[PDB]
Write a protein that binds this ligand. Structure first.
Ligand SMILES: [Mg+2]
Ligand SMILES: [Mg+2]
Ligand SMILES: [Mg+2]
Ligand SMILES: [Mg+2]
Ligand SMILES: [Mg+2]
Ligand SMILES: [Mg+2]
Ligand SMILES: [Mg+2]
Ligand SMILES: [Mg+2]
Ligand SMILES: [Mg+2]
Ligand SMILES: [Mg+2]
Ligand SMILES: [Mg+2]
Ligand SMILES: [Mg+2]
Ligand SMILES: [Mg+2]
Ligand SMILES: [Mg+2]
Ligand SMILES: [Mg+2]
Ligand SMILES: [Mg+2]
Ligand SMILES: [Mg+2]
Ligand SMILES: [Mg+2]
Ligand SMILES: [Mg+2]
Ligand SMILES: [Mg+2]
Ligand SMILES: [Mg+2]
Ligand SMILES: [Mg+2]
Ligand SMILES: [Mg+2]
Ligand SMILES: [Mg+2]
Ligand SMILES: [Mg+2]
Ligand SMILES: [Mg+2]
Ligand SMILES: [Mg+2]
Ligand SMILES: [Mg+2]
Ligand SMILES: [Mg+2]
Ligand SMILES: [Mg+2]
Ligand SMILES: [Mg+2]
Ligand SMILES: [Mg+2]
Ligand SMILES: [Mg+2]
Ligand SMILES: [Mg+2]
Ligand SMILES: [Mg+2]
Ligand SMILES: [Mg+2]
Ligand SMILES: [Mg+2]
Ligand SMILES: [Mg+2]
Ligand SMILES: [Mg+2]
Ligand SMILES: [Mg+2]
Ligand SMILES: [Mg+2]
Ligand SMILES: [Mg+2]
Ligand SMILES: [Mg+2]
Ligand SMILES: [Mg+2]
Ligand SMILES: [Mg+2]
Ligand SMILES: [Mg+2]
Ligand SMILES: [Mg+2]
Ligand SMILES: [Mg+2]
Ligand SMILES: [Mg+2]
Ligand SMILES: [Mg+2]
Ligand SMILES: [Mg+2]
Ligand SMILES: [Mg+2]
Ligand SMILES: [Mg+2]
Ligand SMILES: [Mg+2]
Ligand SMILES: [Mg+2]
Ligand SMILES: [Mg+2]
Lengths: 119, 50, 58, 121, 203
RNA sequence: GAUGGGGAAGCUCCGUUUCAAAGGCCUGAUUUUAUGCAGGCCACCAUCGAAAGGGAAUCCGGUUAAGAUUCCGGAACCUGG
RNA sequence: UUGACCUCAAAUCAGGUAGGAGUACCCGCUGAACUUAAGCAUAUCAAUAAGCGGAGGAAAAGAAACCAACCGGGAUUGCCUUAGUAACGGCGAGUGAAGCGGCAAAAGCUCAAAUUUGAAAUCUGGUACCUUCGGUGCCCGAGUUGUAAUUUGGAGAGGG
């Protein structure tokens, strides 16, 4: 059978912890029964279920942290958008659009005008 | 030998678990070109060199 | 720039300046231009009348 | 006007005030869970033709234990998952990678009654 | 500005006033370390016309280099070759010591960029240079578009590739018939004149 | 064999206590309180390096297809609190 | 006694950066010899291999302290060509550019040296708030040993 991911996001931190303890008793009883019978494929469909509970809990904990650093500077590093190293050590779009005040007068007075040859 | 470190003994576990033939269900698979185990190591002929 | 236009009245010179090449020509300018110049001890008491730290001339 | 008298002929670094950390952001922002759980210390009961002779006769309850567990973390894992007191914890590293644990129980707690209770005999 | 007065006073190096300050500063800088922080420029006219602005980020370092020729590092003067290259002592190090002075402060402060450098003082054993460095990650340098080009990653370690005032001089990048051996790069003008170009429809 | 330093275009070399502001233990002070401060002291000044050097403290009996002064039974010792 | 300046430190102080890999191409340093000269030492191989430092998707060069001697041209790079010529070389072997012309591509510019002086008008950081790859307000600081505005040689500034 196995658990589903969308039915674990509607549960609290206490209920997901209480579900996670019961799933580790499932391996603690079926690894005992693993040496009795020569083949037990039932252990595969529950170790992926613990990997699904540990994903929803890790999802709810990180989203709780993202709501208190929201709207302020100095967020932690793993919450930052990485996207590469080389563009993080680079000029931002505001700092690359910084034109000097002398060239700003030249762009207003004489911009790149359009022209054509027809007559 | 017999009074060793853990790092030397750690590679002995990988060297022991690889000294075995192929499983019997390997040769029956679809499109298999493997006929035997070519990495069989014997302690008398080819030493592992740690 | 105020000495060359004869617009200075009393020029103070601080001896505490460690880059001395900034300040060696200041008694030379005030001598030819007729500006009376004074040498005062410490650039720290010149920053109290101006609310700065380094105020070598006034 | 007078200076400070110095009774020693050696000038040294003055003791200053070292501040404690008041960080603007957490380092990893998530308190990580227990890396070695109570269900991760013990991983498999060992049922050989020799390990079962220590359960019935020697009062030794043999477990297979992960490599990151000492004698401390095995004794508090049997007392938590079973409520069974432990006299001694005895470990050896197997030659095939994992670690074997010989756990001798007390005289008041029998090892054959806990074997058939959980499922292996 | 009064920096025109400092410009003519600095040109009289063998005057009676700049021979007193030469001897005090050659002793003060020798008792300090080889590469140490200079918290204030001693020549405010030279640094300003090289690009020093009195704000947060522009850092002056003072550096010391040894004086003389480059002895060949071969063991015991043994060449093992033709007698043309047999000489050891009289090899004279095709880079300027001003560029070596810029390179040693680059390895120590790898988070700053070497802008320029200038001579201050010397003796028979050392040369003294005040090398100006610009901090690129400071927000006054990331803004203020006069100096936003140093944050571009093609200017990483300009002192090691010859892009400074003494780097382009030692490489010999100038305009002229005298600079035909190197005008845009010596190893680039060497490969344009020895590449045997074989076309599609061969002439 | 790092560091402070001194060389070297540089990979790195020398030195290791030498032209260095190079450090941590006992106790008292507190009854908003946690550990800041008053001392009295102490300058020793990385670290690695011999399962035959130095070096705290266990024995006998029994036991397994193969384990032992390590398990069991009995009897001791040392270190730390 | 107390408050500053200057210089130099201390921090598991607040938050930022490099160091390594790759290395075909690219920027410098350093640097041979076999071979050729029918020997060999200058030369040649070669301002190459190896070694070393440092970047990017290109790098580098670049808006003349230029080419020219003409009715002058007009940043740099690439190609055709000049040319295998001028010249260098026991002028021995060998080595060897550049100006013009045609074409691909074409884009130019800003810092100091000036008194804002009837008003540091400039900027980092902290904090509150928000249409937050940012802005406003506030509080410290950097800074007069000079931060904005103006101009930088083609001009331009101060007056009328
Ligand atoms: Mg990264
Ligand atoms: Mg970053
Ligand atoms: Mg042994
Ligand atoms: Mg043999
Ligand atoms: Mg052999
Ligand atoms: Mg070996
Ligand atoms: Mg053991
Ligand atoms: Mg002169
Ligand atoms: Mg400063
Ligand atoms: Mg030789
Ligand atoms: Mg040689
Ligand atoms: Mg000397
Ligand atoms: Mg350039
Ligand atoms: Mg040439
Ligand atoms: Mg080149
Ligand atoms: Mg050719
Ligand atoms: Mg050629
Ligand atoms: Mg063709
Ligand atoms: Mg043909
Ligand atoms: Mg060493
Ligand atoms: Mg030893
Ligand atoms: Mg040791
Ligand atoms: Mg020993
Ligand atoms: Mg011994
Ligand atoms: Mg016995
Ligand atoms: Mg046994
Ligand atoms: Mg035996
Ligand atoms: Mg016993
Ligand atoms: Mg007893
Ligand atoms: Mg005791
Ligand atoms: Mg910190
Ligand atoms: Mg690198
Ligand atoms: Mg390389
Ligand atoms: Mg080169
Ligand atoms: Mg050479
Ligand atoms: Mg050959
Ligand atoms: Mg020959
Ligand atoms: Mg021959
Ligand atoms: Mg020969
Ligand atoms: Mg030769
Ligand atoms: Mg040849
Ligand atoms: Mg050559
Ligand atoms: Mg190479
Ligand atoms: Mg890249
Ligand atoms: Mg680019
Ligand atoms: Mg392109
Ligand atoms: Mg121009
Ligand atoms: Mg004409
Ligand atoms: Mg041209
Ligand atoms: Mg010819
Ligand atoms: Mg020849
Ligand atoms: Mg010839
Ligand atoms: Mg040649
Ligand atoms: Mg043309
Ligand atoms: Mg432009
Ligand atoms: Mg300006």
């Amino acid at each position: 059978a196995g658990v589903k991911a969308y039915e674990l996001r509607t549960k609290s931190k206490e209920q997901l912890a209480s579900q996670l303890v019961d799933l580790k008793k499932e391996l603690a009883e079926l690894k005992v029964q693993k040496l009795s019978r020569p083949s037990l494929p039932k252990i595969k469909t529950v170790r992926k279920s613990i990997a699904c509970v540990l994903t929803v809990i890790n999802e709810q904990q990180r989203e709780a942290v993202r709501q208190l650093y929201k709207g302020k500077k100095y967020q932690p590093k793993d919450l930052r958008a990485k996207k590469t190293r080389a563009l993080r050590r680079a000029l931002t779009k505001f700092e690359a659009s910084q034109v000097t005040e002398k060239q700003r007068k030249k762009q207003i007075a004489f911009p790149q005008r359009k022209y054509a040859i027809k007559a | 030998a017999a009074q060793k470190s853990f790092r030397i003994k750690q590679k002995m576990a990988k060297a022991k678990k690889q000294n075995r033939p192929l499983p019997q269900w390997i040769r029956l698979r679809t499109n298999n070109t493997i006929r035997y185990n070519a990495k069989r190591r014997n302690w008398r002929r080819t030493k592992m060199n740690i | 720039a105020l000495i060359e236009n004869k617009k200075a009245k009393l020029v103070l010179i601080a001896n505490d300046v460690d880059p001395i090449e900034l300040v060696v020509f200041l008694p030379a300018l005030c001598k030819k231009m007729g500006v009376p110049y004074a040498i005062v001890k410490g650039k720290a008491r010149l920053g109290t009348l101006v609310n700065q730290k380094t105020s070598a001339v006034a | 006007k007078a200076l400070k008298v110095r009774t020693s002929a050696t000038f040294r670094l003055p003791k200053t005030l070292k501040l404690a950390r008041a960080p603007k952001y957490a380092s990893k922002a998530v308190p990580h869970y227990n890396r070695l759980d109570s269900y991760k210390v013990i991983e498999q009961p060992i049922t050989s033709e020799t390990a079962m002779k220590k359960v019935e006769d020697g009062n030794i309850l043999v477990f297979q234990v992960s490599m990151k567990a000492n004698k401390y973390q095995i004794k508090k894992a049997v007392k938590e998952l079973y409520e069974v007191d432990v006299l001694k914890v005895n470990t050896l590293v197997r030659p095939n990678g994992t670690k074997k644990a010989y756990v001798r129980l007390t005289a008041d707690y029998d090892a054959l009654d806990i074997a058939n209770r959980i499922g292996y005999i | 500005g009064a920096y025109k007065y400092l410009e003519e006073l600095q040109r009289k190096k063998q005057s009676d006033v700049l021979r007193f300050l030469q001897r005090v500063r050659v002793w003060e800088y020798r008792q300090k370390n080889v590469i140490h922080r200079a918290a204030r420029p001693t020549r405010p006219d030279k640094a300003r016309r090289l690009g020093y602005k009195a704000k947060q980020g522009f850092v002056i370092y003072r550096v010391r280099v040894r004086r003389g020729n480059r002895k060949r590092p071969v063991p015991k003067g043994a060449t093992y070759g033709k007698p043309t290259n047999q000489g050891v002592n009289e090899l004279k190090y095709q880079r300027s010591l001003r560029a070596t002075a810029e390179e040693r402060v680059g390895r120590r402060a790898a988070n700053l960029r070497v802008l320029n450098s200038y001579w201050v003082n010397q003796d028979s054993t050392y040369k003294y240079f005040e090398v100006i460095l610009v901090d690129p990650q400071h927000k006054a340098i990331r803004r203020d578009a006069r100096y936003n080009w140093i944050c571009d990653p093609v200017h990483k370690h300009r002192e090691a590739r010859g892009l400074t005032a003494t780097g382009k001089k030692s490489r010999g990048i100038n305009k002229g018939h005298k600079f035909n051996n190197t005008k845009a790069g010596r190893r680039k003008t060497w490969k344009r004149q020895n590449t045997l170009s074989l076309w599609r429809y061969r002439k």
